[PDB]
Amino acid sequence: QSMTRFDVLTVGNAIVDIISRCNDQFLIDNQITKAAMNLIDAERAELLYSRMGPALEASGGSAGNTAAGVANLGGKAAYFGNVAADQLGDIFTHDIRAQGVHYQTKPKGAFPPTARSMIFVTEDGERSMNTYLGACVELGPEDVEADVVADAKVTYFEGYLWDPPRAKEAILDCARIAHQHGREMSMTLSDSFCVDRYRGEFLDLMRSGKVDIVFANRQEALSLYQTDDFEEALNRIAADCKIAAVTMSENGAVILKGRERYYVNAIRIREVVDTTGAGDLFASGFLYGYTQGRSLEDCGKLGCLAAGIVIQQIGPRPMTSLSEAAKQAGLI
Amino acid sequence: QSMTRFDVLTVGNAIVDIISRCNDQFLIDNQITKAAMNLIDAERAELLYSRMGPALEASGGSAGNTAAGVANLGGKAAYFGNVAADQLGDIFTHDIRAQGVHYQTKPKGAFPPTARSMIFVTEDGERSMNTYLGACVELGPEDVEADVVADAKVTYFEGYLWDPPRAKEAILDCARIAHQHGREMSMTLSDSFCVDRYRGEFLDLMRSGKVDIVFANRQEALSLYQTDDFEEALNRIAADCKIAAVTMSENGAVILKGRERYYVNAIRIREVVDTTGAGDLFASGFLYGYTQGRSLEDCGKLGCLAAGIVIQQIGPRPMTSLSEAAKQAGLI
Ligand SMILES: Nc1ncnc2c1ncn2[C@@H]1O[C@H](CO)[C@@H](O)[C@H]1O
Ligand SMILES: Nc1ncnc2c1ncn2[C@@H]1O[C@H](CO)[C@@H](O)[C@H]1O
Ligand SMILES: CCc1ccccc1CO
Ligand SMILES: CCc1ccccc1CO
Ligand SMILES: [K+]
Ligand SMILES: [K+]
């Protein structure tokens, strides 16, 4: 057909973020692992919320943010993720659809309720997330819109999807459909503790070719091979997947393809407000560039631009025009 | 007794804000009165939401913001306002309590649902609100915690309360209880169209002595006497209430008591980001000052500081420390 309905389909845990500031002692007092995604049950969610200061709500979900970012840039995006039939679910549905992302996953009931993450931003701008999965545990093969996967240049998913019980089945279904239709699969390693949990599974997805493009930050790449040697991590990840995009925070990023390396610089920041969404938006920029036929370096540049923008605001999805910024940057 | 549980009790429509940016044509296309509080029904709320871009949620409510502001400054605050037993009501309840405000108004059920206001912020930083009152229509005399009123130095309420059916009955009960215990009553005129709707009623509250301190902006003062002569509005408002605090946006504010007038300058600002909450937070600073025995001029200065802070951020409640800012500004 070579007119394809979607550039990027993303699949992830559909989450509403609940965002507040705290001091670092707050994290110690509450045994929250700093800079990480901390899974919590319903009881702990109530407890942490009762200790949290006044907050702001914003639609989140790592892959949700990535899909929103692609649409913002001007690409055609779709999302699979499960919310509940509740007000948080309505908020999530509105936000992603209002950005121009195709989102048609039907809620299954009011319980478990829509996933939320209590995100605590410390003075350094680091974020520490405390996520109750709620309705995310219900995502499964029944939620795969086969025609959408078939009609999407790239299907991208979260490592985080290995926590709920049935999501991985949906992903395997996606990989089959995408590849039978000549499309590509991509994943993010998500979080270094997530990598600790599913290391063998993730390596298997890469080595079997179910995943073609892998996103990682330094911490995740190191965790993947249980090494403190970043150069080893880079060499191995390159051997394990067709393309790897490895972010290094303020040190930019490196794109790896076989023996090719392409290094990109980070944009010089005024002040880091909140790092929430940085990796998500790097992926939006990269995949937007990738599905527009841009060079790997230019994909990296677009990722860095989008990540740099998101970290200068509160909230995980840029409130400003990424396409406008990309035009100004000569990235177009 | 000479110990009082509360400095300021506030009473208002309990609302969660849904905040987005729009261009000025959006307001025209949707027939939204710029800079005003536009009341909407359920059907309209759904329509407007469907046309709204991605949004952020934050606890609002004019008097809610004012109570939160007083508590942020270090005063002792309480709030009466009615939410539903739903997720938006839970968010509202959390945010105001987490600020250290006494909030004990019991939801009556899930329906009508918790009030929300779609607030569109234009490029000039002006905010245009579209409010579905939902559970606010249920606030009545049954919600008056008589001991809280009796133990508060000042009970402050919104003119906006004249829209729901029975809220005014609660306010009359508050006025009786406050004055029988030697406390003071205060109101804000809220909005110039709200003044158009309830002009006679508001003047009656002031002239009968049920209200002692009145807050108004320029537009509201002009509306109250249906005049284009600001000097006349000031002279008349000073005649109608014991104390009047009249704000003039970038021109600061004037405090009137009998024949006394006290002019206070606006603080220097970086940028008008979002004007939402300006008037609310002016009242926070004024009423905190007032209940700490500060002079009327210093009350005005504390108001202008709190207002100028809130307009430089997204959302109606300052995310930073007002007491620290007050100390730093030498108001202490
Ligand atoms: N378990 C999880 N799965 C997917 N996304 C998550 C999880 N926990 C937090 N998030 C999202 O991570 C985003 C930041 O990358 C936040 O917007 C937050 O919603
Ligand atoms: N009808 C209403 N009554 C009380 N407060 C309102 C109303 N409509 C909007 N608001 C609030 O006014 C605040 C700005 O002053 C916002 O936080 C918003 O929640
Ligand atoms: C909706 C706010 C919230 C967050 C975590 C746990 C419980 C609640 C209340 O519904
Ligand atoms: C809570 C989001 C919202 C806002 C206005 C009108 C309807 C809805 C749907 O829940
Ligand atoms: K951010
Ligand atoms: K504001």
DSSP letters, B114-176, are: PEEEEEEE-TTS-EEEEEE-GGGGG--GGG--HHHHHTEEEEEEEGGGGSSSSHHHHHHHHHH
Ligand 3 atom nearest to CA at A113: 10
- CA angle A272–A278–A280, rounded 5-degree value: 165
Q: What backbone phi and psi angles, to 5 degrees, belong to B142?
A: -65, -20
Question: In chain A, which residues are followed by a C-to-N distance beyond 2.5 Å, i.e. a gap?
Answer: none
Residue A156: its H or E element: strand A152-158
CB A64 within 8 A of CB A96: yes
CA distances to B120, B122, B127 from B23, rounded to whole Å, are: 9, 6, 11
Interatomic CA distance for residues A283 and A302, integer angstroms: 9
Q: Which amino acid is at B332?
A: I
Q: Which among B280, B289, B62, B13 has a CA at the least distance from the CA of B153?
A: B289
Interatomic CA distance for residues B275 and B177, integer angstroms: 34
In the 3-class helix/strand/coil scheme, how is B226-271 assigned residue by residue? CCCCHHHHHHHHHHHCCEEEEECHHHCEEEEECCEEEEECCCCCCC
Neighbour-count burial of B71, counting CB atoms closer than 10 A to its CB (0-12 exposed, 13-18 middle, 19+ buried): buried
Beta strands B77-80 and B102-103: pairing type?
parallel
| Token pair 């025209």 in the structure block, residue | B28
Q: Which among B302, B290, B311, B297 has a CA at the least distance from the CA of B332?
A: B302
Give B93's Cβ-side CA count (13 Å radius). 16
Residue from A10, A11, A13 whose mutation best tests the ligand 1 pocket (most atoms within 8 A of CB): A13
Residue B215: its H or E element: strand B213-217
CA distances to A114, A269, A280, B318 from A51, rounded to whole Å, are: 21, 32, 28, 19
CB B291 within 8 A of CB B7: yes
Q: How was this structure determined?
A: X-ray
Cα B116 to ligand 2 centre (Å): 9
Interatomic CA distance for residues B154 and B237, integer angstroms: 20
Select the residue from A51, A59, A87 to test the B interface by mutation, using most B Cβ atoms within 10 A.
A87
- CATH class of segment(s) B1-332: alpha beta
B26 reaches A (C-beta below 8 A): no
- Beta-sheet strand order (sheet of B15-21): A37-39, A127-132, A115-121, A15-21, A56-59, B56-59, B15-21, B115-121, B127-132, B37-39
Q: Which among B280, B268, B271, B252 has a CA at the least distance from the CA of B119?
A: B280
Angle in degrees, 0-180, between the axes of helices A278-291 and A296-310, rounded to the nearest 10? 150
Q: Which amino acid is at B7?
A: D
Interatomic CA distance for residues A160 and A223, integer angstroms: 15
Interatomic CA distance for residues A28 and A24, integer angstroms: 7
Cα B122 to ligand 5 centre (Å): 22
Residue A198: its H or E element: helix A192-207
CB B38 within 8 A of CB B118: no
Q: Is A226 left (phi over 0), alpha (psi -120 to 50) or beta?
A: left
CB B157 within 8 A of CB B183: no
* Cα torsion through B36, B39, B45, B49, rounded to 10: 0
Interatomic CA distance for residues B15 and B20, integer angstroms: 16
Interatomic CA distance for residues A246 and A237, integer angstroms: 9
Interatomic CA distance for residues A192 and A35, integer angstroms: 10
Interatomic CA distance for residues A239 and B257, integer angstroms: 79
| Count of Cβ atoms closer than 10 Å to residue B239 Cβ | 12
CA distances to A96, A302, B35, B56 from B52, rounded to whole Å, are: 12, 27, 17, 11
Neighbour-count burial of B197, counting CB atoms closer than 10 A to its CB (0-12 exposed, 13-18 middle, 19+ buried): middle
Neighbour-count burial of B250, counting CB atoms closer than 10 A to its CB (0-12 exposed, 13-18 middle, 19+ buried): exposed
- Whether A191 has a binding-site annotation, put simply, is no
Beta strands A77-80 and A102-103: pairing type?
parallel
Q: Which amino acid is at B191?
A: D
Interatomic CA distance for residues B80 and B170, integer angstroms: 10
Q: Which among B125, B114, B127, B113 has a CA at the least distance from the CA of B59?
A: B114
CA distances to A178, A318, B30, B123 from B26, rounded to whole Å, are: 39, 20, 6, 12
Residue from B19, B56, B57, B129 whose mutation best tests the ligand 2 pocket (most atoms within 8 A of CB): B129
Structure tokens at A66: 């990535």
E strand map for A161-285: 184-188, 213-217, 243-247, 253-257, 260-264
Q: Is A150 left (phi over 0), alpha (psi -120 to 50) or beta?
A: alpha
Q: Is A54's CB within 8 Å of B21's CB?
A: no
CB A222 within 8 A of CB A236: no
Select the residue from A57, A97, A310, A320 to test the B interface by mutation, using most B Cβ atoms within 10 A.
A57
Q: What backbone phi and psi angles, to 5 degrees, belong to A287?
A: -70, -30
Interatomic CA distance for residues B167 and B171, integer angstroms: 6
CA distance B99 to chain A (A): 6
CB B54 within 8 A of CB A320: no
Radius of gyration over alpha carbons of chain B, in Å? 18
CB A94 within 8 A of CB B49: yes
Interatomic CA distance for residues A130 and A49, integer angstroms: 10
Q: Which among B37, B139, B39, B42 has a CA at the least distance from the CA of B83?
A: B139
Which residues are near ligand 6, the ion (C-beta closer than 5 Å)?
Answer: B 274, 276-277, 310
- CA angle B47–A99–B131, rounded 5-degree value: 35
Interatomic CA distance for residues A95 and A117, integer angstroms: 16
Q: Which among B200, B224, B228, B226 has a CA at the least distance from the CA of B214?
A: B224
Interatomic CA distance for residues A3 and A172, integer angstroms: 25
Residues in chain B: 332
DSSP assigned state of A177? H
CB A98 within 8 A of CB A72: no
DSSP assigned state of A114? P
Residue A203: its H or E element: helix A192-207
Q: Which ligand is nearest to the CA of A307?
A: 5
CB B303 within 8 A of CB B279: no
Structure tokens at A179: 């590849």
Interatomic CA distance for residues B90 and A51, integer angstroms: 14
For A102-126, give one letter per residue: b (16+ CB within 10 A) or e: bbebebbeeebbbbbbbbbbbeebb
Structure tokens at A36: 């990480």
* Cα torsion through B303, B307, B309, B315, rounded to 10: 140
